[PDB]
Amino acid sequence: NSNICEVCNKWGRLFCCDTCPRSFHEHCHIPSVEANKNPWSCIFCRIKTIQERCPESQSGHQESEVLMRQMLPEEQLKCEFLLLKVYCDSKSCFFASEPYYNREGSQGPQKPMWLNKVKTSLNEQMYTRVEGFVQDMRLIFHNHKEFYREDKFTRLGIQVQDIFEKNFRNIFAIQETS
Ligand SMILES: [Zn+2]
Ligand SMILES: [Zn+2]
Q1: Which ligand sits closest to the CA of 14?
Q2: Ligand 2 centroid to 28 CA: how many Å?
Q3: Where do the domains of the chain lie, and which CATH numbers do they carry?
């Protein structure tokens, strides 16, 4: 297995997947690494298995249909995975913890949102439909773009939103369009 965490790319106390070469810090994996199991398969492997069990799951879907899906175990896992893919980008650090807003000429958002909050909400089974998770994720980037206005720092929200959206389309097999 790899000698660095798949998510944060650092060494440390690592847990190795038994079905692929990836390794993870306990709380870098989502869900947190469940240490009782042996064999243990990571989320990448679990997602691949869902895919292989139901090959037609990879045919194109409409975003509107995907968002209305109830958060049954398969969809819960897909949202956990999509969240993990965002954390895998180093620029997620800007969006991970609770923000605060005090900049001349701007007012903070009415509903602040951050990745660790989404992570807790998933862990606590607070989303009933994929829509709730996707709305909170999109809110993170929208809040950022609105607050930073014309500061070049606004670009960080565009960049991380693009990671989110590319991964959403992949994981939920959104129908390709131009
Ligand atoms: Zn890590
Ligand atoms: Zn694996």
Answers
A1: 1
A2: 14
A3: 1-59 (3.30.40.10), 60-178 (1.20.920.10)
